[PDB]
C-alpha cells in the first residue's frame, strides 16, 4: 500500500520554492539546422518529455544561462555513446539565481523537447561548445488499414470503449479489411499503436502491482525514459524515429531484462526487475540533483540485496519528501550503489525503499 503523494518528487521542491516559471513552448521546424549551446558537464542521455534539474556554478554556464533566459531558453544535451552523434534539446521552464555559500549558483529545471543528430561541434573561445545540429521529426504513421479500408464499413471505425473479449472484438473489427491484403489480423496487431500500448501497460503492471499518457508518442518516450536499461539501448531507443517502432523495441527490451548487478563486480546481484516500483507519477526512474550539482538517475525499488548502509540517516535535500537516506554501497567491493530511504513518520507507506543510481548498476 502506498499513500505517499506521487506528485511531490516531480516538483523537485528540494531545489526550493518561489522559483521563476515560464510558459510558451518553443519548437523548431522538424528538419532544419540550428546552433545550440551545449552544457559541458551533463553526462546524461536526455529523452524528450523528461525533466532535468541542474545547479550550475561555473562562470561559463552561469553566463550562458543568464543569456538564455533572455533568448530561446534552449540548450543541447549530447547522448554520448562512449563521441556524440545524437542528442536532445532541453528547454528551461524554471529558474532562480542565488548567492548561497559564497558563490553565485543558478538552479534551473529544464525539459526535453526535440531530438537531433549532431552535425558539428565548435568550441567557442569560452571553452564552451556550440552544436550545429539538424532537428529530427517524429514520423507519425496512419492506421495500417487506412489505405486498404473498405468504404462501406468505414462507419464501423468508431468503437464504444469501456476486457479481453473487448480487445478480441477490437482486433476482429478494426482489421477486417486485413482480409484484402496478404497478412492476417494478428500480424497487423503487432504494429498497432493501441495494442502495443495496452500490452506495455499490462506488462508493467505485472511488475508494479499498484501501477502513463494516452498518445502513443508520449507513451513511448515515457516508457523509454523509465526503464532499467543501460546506455547503448537507451541511445538505440533515442535514434528510433517512429512511435510504433519505439513501442515494439521497448516491448522487446522489456521482455528480455531480468536482473541488475553491481557494475564494478558483475556477479553481485543488487536487485531484480520485479522490485521496481513507481514512487513518483513520472515513473520508476527519474533524474535528480544532489546539493553539489551532480545528476543521478535514481530507480526506486522495494528490496535490494548485498548493500551495506553507511552514515547517519538525513532528511537533508531529500528527493522524496518525508524520507531520509543512508548511503548504500556494495558489500563485496564497497562501491556506492544508491541510498536507502526510510519514513520519518508512522502511518506512512512505504516505510522503506531503495533509490539506486543507474550508473552504478548493470543489467543482466
Amino acid at each position: 500500500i502506498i499513500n505517499f503523494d506521487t506528485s511531490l518528487p516531480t516538483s523537485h521542491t528540494y531545489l526550493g520554492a518561489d522559483m521563476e516559471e515560464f510558459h510558451g513552448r518553443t519548437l523548431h521546424d522538424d528538419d532544419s539546422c540550428q546552433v545550440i549551446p551545449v552544457l559541458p558537464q551533463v553526462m546524461m542521455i536526455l529523452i524528450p518529455g523528461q525533466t532535468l534539474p541542474l545547479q550550475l556554478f561555473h562562470p561559463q554556464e552561469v553566463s550562458m544561462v543568464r543569456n538564455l533566459i533572455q533568448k530561446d531558453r534552449t540548450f543541447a544535451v549530447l547522448a554520448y555513446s562512449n563521441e556524440a552523434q545524437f542528442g536532445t534539446t532541453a528547454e528551461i521552464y524554471a529558474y532562480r539565481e542565488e548567492q548561497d555559500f559564497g558563490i553565485e549558483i543558478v538552479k534551473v529545471k529544464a525539459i526535453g523537447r526535440q531530438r537531433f543528430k549532431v552535425l558539428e561541434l565548435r568550441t567557442q573561445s569560452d571553452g564552451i561548445q556550440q552544436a550545429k545540429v539538424q532537428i529530427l521529426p517524429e514520423c507519425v504513421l496512419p492506421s495500417t488499414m487506412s489505405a486498404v479500408q473498405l468504404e462501406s464499413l468505414n462507419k464501423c471505425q468508431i468503437f464504444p470503449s469501456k476486457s479481453y473479449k473487448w480487445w478480441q472484438k477490437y482486433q476482429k473489427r478494426k482489421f477486417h479489411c486485413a482480409n484484402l491484403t496478404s497478412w492476417p489480423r494478428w500480424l497487423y496487431s503487432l504494429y498497432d499503436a493501441e495494442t502495443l500500448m495496452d500490452r506495455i501497460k499490462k506488462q508493467l503492471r505485472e511488475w508494479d502491482e499498484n501501477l502513463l499518457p494516452s498518445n502513443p508518442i508520449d507513451f513511448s518516450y515515457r516508457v523509454a525514459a523509465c526503464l532499467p536499461i543501460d546506455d547503448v539501448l537507451r541511445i538505440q531507443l533515442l535514434k528510433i524515429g517512429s512511435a510504433i517502432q519505439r513501442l515494439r523495441c521497448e516491448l522487446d527490451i522489456m521482455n528480455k531484462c531480468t536482473s541488475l548487478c553491481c557494475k564494478q563486480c558483475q556477479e553481485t546481484e543488487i536487485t531484480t526487475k520485479n522490485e521496481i516500483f513507481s514512487l513518483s507519477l513520472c515513473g520508476p526512474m527519474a533524474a535528480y540533483v544532489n546539493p553539489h550539482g551532480y545528476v543521478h538517475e535514481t530507480l526506486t525499488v522495494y528490496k535490494a540485496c548485498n548493500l551495506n548502509l553507511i552514515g547517519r540517516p538525513s532528511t537533508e535535500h531529500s528527493w522524496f519528501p518525508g524520507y531520509a537516506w543512508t548511503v548504500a554501497q556494495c558489500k563485496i567491493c564497497a562501491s556506492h550503489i544508491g541510498w536507502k530511504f526510510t519514513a520519518t513518520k508512522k502511518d506512512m507507506s512505504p516505510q522503506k525503499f531503495w533509490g539506486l543510481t543507474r550508473s552504478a548498476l548493470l543489467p543482466t
Binding site: 507519425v140 504513421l141 492506421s143 468504404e151 471505425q157 484484402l180 492476417p184 524515429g241 517502432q245
Partner: protein
C-alpha cells in the same frame, strides 16, 4: 533508375455506383466508379448498354448526381482521394461524346487531421450547396451558385468531433443536416441548419436524441415522410420531430448493414445489404390523416454477393457492386422460389480483386505466360486464369491466400482458409476444402465460446487441366499457414510443397511456436515427409541455391535438406525487424518488414553466414517488395505509391540505399512477380507483373537513359495537349503522396499516358512532336513506331 509502368488489366472492383439521368433527360443511366474508371451505361429492357468509359486522374472517393434548377439533365460531382473536386456534364453531338468540366478545384485544408470514418460527401436536395466531411471538427460547405466555377468552400466548426454519418434532410426550407455522433455518453442523433449568408450552423428543427450504442447508418427519407431512419446492429429507428418509431427485428441481428438504396421515389421501400451477402427489404407503412408513417418491417429478400453498394435500376432489377467478388445484376420477384429466396441472378461482371497472390505459369508449353491469381475472400474466393485479355474463373467458396505451381506433378498448391462456427465446430457452406476428392488432417503430436468464428487452414492440391481439388490437407487447430513454396532441396531429386505455419492463440500477442512441414504429392495422395518445429512464426520462405531460407519472427535461417530427410540448420541472421518480405536473387537476400525498413544481406558460401551489405530504414507502411536487378529494388508504399531504391567508396555511404524513383500508382499492390503475358522473343529490359487490391494488374519494366529522356519529354508535351477530365494535372496525379508529404514523380514513366498518344488525332500529334529531337528532329511517324513498340510489351 528508369522504369516504365503500364496497366495490363484495368481495375475491376466497384467502389461506388449511382443511377440517374446523366446522358439524356429521358434515358436512365447507371454510373460506376471502380477505382479511377468512370463507366456510364444506359439502363435498357435488355440489360445495360455501355455508352462511355472515362479515366480519372484520381481515386474516386465521392460520386453523386444532382440537378440544380435550370439544368436539363443531371450534373456529376466527383471528389478524388487527393481532394480534387469537379462538377462534370455529359455533352454529346453525333457519334462524338465527351465530358465537359462545368467546374473544378482542390478542396484540401493545409492543416487538420483526416477523419477516421473517412471522406463523407452529400448534396442538399434543393442543390443549395454540397457538404463534405474530410477532417475532424470541420464541415466544408461548397455553395452551388453558378458563379462558383472554382468551388470556393468554407469550413464550419463542428463541436462534435466523432461524427459517424450525416445526411441532408428532405422537406426542409432551411438546409438541414442530420448526423449521428459518439461521445462518452453514447451515440446521439443531432440536426443542424446551414446558413450560407451567415456561413454557420443554427439549431436544427428537432431535438437531439439518444440511439443505439452501435447505430451507424443514417437515411434521409423523402416526402411525405421526411425525418430520418437510424440503423444499427440491433434496431431500426425512425425520427421525425414528434414522431418516433423503432423495431428490433431478429433477422438483422447476425451481421451489420453496410449499404442501402431507396427503391421508390416516395421512400416507401429500401434495399439493405449486410456484410455477409444478405439482401433485405425495408418497408415504410403509410397512413393518411397530412400523411404519417405507420410502421416499419424488414423482409429477408435473399442472398447476393458481398455488396459494396446497391442500386435499384427499375422493373425489379438491382445492381450489386462488390469489392470482394464479381458484381451482379439480379432480378427481384414478387414470390419466392422453392428455396425461399426472392433474388435471381441475371448477369455477372468479372472482378479479379483482391489479388492477394499469383504466379506465372506456361501451362500450354507455348512460350506465352499465363497468370494464375488468388482472388476474392470469404464465399467469393476464386482462382483466376488470365491469358492474352481472357479470364477463366474457378470458384472455391473460401479465401485463397497463397499459390504455387509444381510441374513434376502438374498441380497447383493453394493455401486456403475457411470460417467455421463453434457449435466442436461447424461449417457455413460447402467449399473446396470439404468437397475434395481426397482429404487428410494434420496428425502432428507437437504442441473459446459458443457461436464464435474460427479459421481453418488447408493446403489444396488442384489439377491444372480441370482445376478439380485433388487433395485437401487440414492443418492443426489454431494453426495459421503463412507461406508456401514448391522446390527441390539438396541432392534429393523429388519436388515438395513446403508450408510454414504459426500457432496463434488469442491470449498471446506474438506467436512463439510454428512449423515447417514438407509434403510430397505422389500417386494421387499427399504425405508429410518432414516437420521441423520452430520458436516463431514462419513469415516467409524461399529456395536459396538448393537450400531453404525461412523467416522466423526477427530471424532469418538457412536450412539444408539432409540425406535422412530432415531440415538441418546452416546459419542464422538476426535483425531489428521482422522479415515479412524475403526475396532472393543470386546470392543476395532482400529483407523487408511492414514499416518500409529494407535490408540487403549477402551469402558468403565459404564462410557460410550472412552479413549486411546495405540498409535503408524509413517509417512507412510497405505492402510488397521485389528485386528488379542486382542493384535496384522495387516496392509498394503507403498512400498507393511505388518506390525504387538503389545500391562513393565510403563504407557508410556504400551501406546506404538511395531512393532513385518515386511514383503514385493509385493502387494498393499486393504482390510482385517476374513474368510476362506476351510471346517470348528489346528497348525494355525485365518484366514484373504486380497485382493489387482493386483487381488491376500492372507491368513494370526498365528503360535506357535515352528512352527514358525521350518518353519524359513526350510526357511533358502530352500533358499540354490532353484534356484531363476534371482538369487534374497529371504531374499532380502522379506525385508521390504521403501524410503531409508530397514529392514530384521521379524515375518512372506513366505508360498509360504515353500509350494514349495514339488515340489523339493527327493534328494533335503534330502539335506534340514539334521540335522534339530523335540527333535528328523527330516526326510523328517515328513516335508512332516508338509507341507501338512500347505497347507490344503486354
Amino acid at each position: 533508375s528508369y522504369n516504365y509502368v503500364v496497366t495490363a488489366q484495368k481495375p475491376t472492383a466497384v467502389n461506388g455506383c449511382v443511377t440517374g439521368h446523366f446522358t439524356s433527360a429521358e434515358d436512365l443511366n447507371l454510373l460506376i466508379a471502380k477505382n479511377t474508371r468512370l463507366e456510364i451505361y444506359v439502363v435498357t429492357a435488355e440489360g445495360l448498354r455501355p455508352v462511355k468509359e472515362v479515366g480519372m486522374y484520381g481515386k474516386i472517393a465521392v460520386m453523386e448526381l444532382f440537378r440544380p434548377k435550370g439544368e436539363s439533365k443531371d450534373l456529376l460531382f466527383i471528389l478524388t482521394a487527393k481532394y480534387n473536386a469537379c462538377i462534370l456534364e455529359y455533352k454529346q453531338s453525333g457519334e462524338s461524346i465527351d465530358i465537359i468540366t462545368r467546374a473544378h478545384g482542390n478542396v484540401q485544408d493545409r492543416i487538420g487531421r483526416p477523419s477516421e470514418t473517412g471522406i463523407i460527401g452529400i448534396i442538399d436536395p434543393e442543390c443549395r450547396m454540397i457538404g463534405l466531411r474530410l477532417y475532424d471538427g470541420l464541415f466544408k460547405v461548397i455553395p452551388l451558385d453558378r458563379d462558383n466555377k472554382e468551388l470556393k468552400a468554407f469550413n464550419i466548426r463542428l463541436e462534435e468531433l466523432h461524427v459517424i454519418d450525416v445526411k441532408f434532410l428532405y422537406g426542409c426550407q432551411a438546409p438541414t443536416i442530420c448526423f449521428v455522433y459518439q461521445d462518452p455518453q453514447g451515440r446521439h442523433v443531432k440536426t443542424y441548419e446551414v446558413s450560407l449568408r451567415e456561413k454557420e450552423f443554427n439549431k436544427g428543427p428537432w431535438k437531439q436524441e439518444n440511439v443505439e450504442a452501435e447505430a451507424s447508418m443514417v437515411i434521409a427519407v423523402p416526402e411525405p415522410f421526411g425525418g430520418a431512419i437510424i440503423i444499427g446492429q440491433e434496431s431500426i429507428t425512425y425520427h421525425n420531430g414528434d414522431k418516433y418509431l423503432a423495431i428490433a427485428p431478429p433477422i438483422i441481428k447476425q451481421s451489420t448493414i453496410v449499404c442501402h438504396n431507396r427503391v421508390d421515389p416516395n421512400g416507401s421501400r429500401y434495399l439493405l445489404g449486410d456484410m455477409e451477402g444478405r439482401l433485405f427489404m425495408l418497408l415504410l407503412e403509410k397512413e393518411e390523416q397530412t400523411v404519417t408513417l405507420k410502421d416499419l418491417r424488414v423482409e429477408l429478400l435473399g442472398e447476393t454477393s458481398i455488396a459494396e453498394c446497391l442500386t435499384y435500376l427499375d422493373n425489379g432489377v438491382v445492381f450489386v457492386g462488390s469489392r470482394l467478388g464479381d458484381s451482379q445484376l439480379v432480378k427481384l420477384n414478387v414470390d419466392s422460389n422453392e428455396q425461399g429466396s426472392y433474388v435471381v441472378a441475371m448477369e455477372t461482371f468479372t472482378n479479379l480483386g483482391p489479388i492477394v497472390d499469383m504466379c506465372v505459369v506456361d501451362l500450354e508449353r507455348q512460350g506465352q505466360g499465363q497468370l494464375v491469381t488468388c482472388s476474392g475472400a470469404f464465399k467469393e474466393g476464386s482462382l483466376r486464369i488470365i491469358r492474352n485479355l481472357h479470364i477463366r474463373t474457378v470458384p472455391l467458396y473460401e479465401s485463397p491466400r497463397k499459390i504455387c505451381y509444381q510441374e513434376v506433378s502438374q498441380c497447383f498448391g493453394v493455401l486456403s482458409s475457411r470460417i467455421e462456427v463453434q457449435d466442436g465446430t461447424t461449417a457455413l457452406r460447402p467449399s473446396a476444402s470439404t468437397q475434395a476428392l481426397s482429404s487428410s488432417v494434420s496428425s502432428s503430436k507437437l504442441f473459446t465460446s459458443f457461436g464464435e468464428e474460427v479459421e481453418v487452414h488447408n493446403l489444396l492440391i488442384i489439377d491444372q487441366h480441370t482445376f478439380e481439388v485433388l487433395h485437401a490437407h487440414q492443418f492443426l487447430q489454431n494453426e495459421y499457414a503463412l507461406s508456401l513454396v514448391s522446390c527441390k532441396l539438396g541432392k534429393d531429386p523429388n519436388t515438395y510443397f513446403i508450408v510454414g505455419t504459426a500457432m496463434v492463440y488469442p491470449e498471446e500477442a506474438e506467436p512463439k511456436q510454428g512449423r515447417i512441414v514438407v509434403f510430397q504429392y505422389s500417386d494421387g495422395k499427399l504425405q508429410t515427409v518432414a516437420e521441423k518445429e520452430v520458436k516463431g512464426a514462419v513469415y516467409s520462405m524461399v529456395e536459396f541455391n538448393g537450400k531453404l531460407l525461412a523467416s522466423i519472427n526477427s530471424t532469418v535461417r538457412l536450412y539444408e535438406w539432409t540425406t535422412e530427410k530432415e531440415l538441418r540448420t546452416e546459419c542464422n541472421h538476426y535483425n531489428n525487424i521482422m522479415a515479412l518480405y524475403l526475396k532472393t536473387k543470386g546470392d543476395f537476400i532482400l529483407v523487408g518488414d511492414l514499416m518500409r525498413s529494407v535490408l540487403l544481406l549477402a551469402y558468403k558460401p565459404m564462410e557460410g553466414n550472412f552479413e549486411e551489405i546495405a540498409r535503408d530504414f524509413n517509417p512507412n507502411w510497405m505492402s510488397a517488395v521485389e528485386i528488379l536487378d542486382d542493384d535496384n529494388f522495387l516496392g509498394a508504399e503507403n498512400a498507393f505509391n511505388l518506390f525504387v531504391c538503389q545500391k562513393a567508396t565510403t563504407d557508410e555511404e556504400r551501406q546506404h540505399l538511395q531512393e532513385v524513383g518515386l511514383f503514385h500508382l493509385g493502387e494498393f499492390v499486393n504482390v510482385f512477380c517476374h513474368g510476362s503475358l506476351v510471346m517470348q522473343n528489346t528497348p525494355t529490359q525485365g518484366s514484373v507483373l504486380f497485382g493489387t487490391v482493386n483487381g488491376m494488374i500492372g507491368l513494370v519494366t526498365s528503360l535506357s537513359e535515352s528512352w527514358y529522356n525521350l518518353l519524359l519529354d513526350m510526357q511533358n508535351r502530352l500533358n499540354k495537349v490532353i484534356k484531363s477530365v476534371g482538369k487534374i494535372e497529371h504531374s499532380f496525379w502522379r506525385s508521390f503522396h504521403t501524410e503531409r508529404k508530397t514529392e514530384p514523380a521521379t524515375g518512372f514513366i506513366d505508360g498509360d499516358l504515353i500509350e494514349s498518344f495514339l488515340d489523339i488525332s493527327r493534328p494533335k500529334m503534330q502539335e506534340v512532336v514539334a521540335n522534339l529531337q530523335y540527333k535528328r528532329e523527330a516526326t510523328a511517324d517515328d513516335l508512332i513506331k516508338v509507341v507501338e513498340e512500347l505497347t507490344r510489351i503486354h
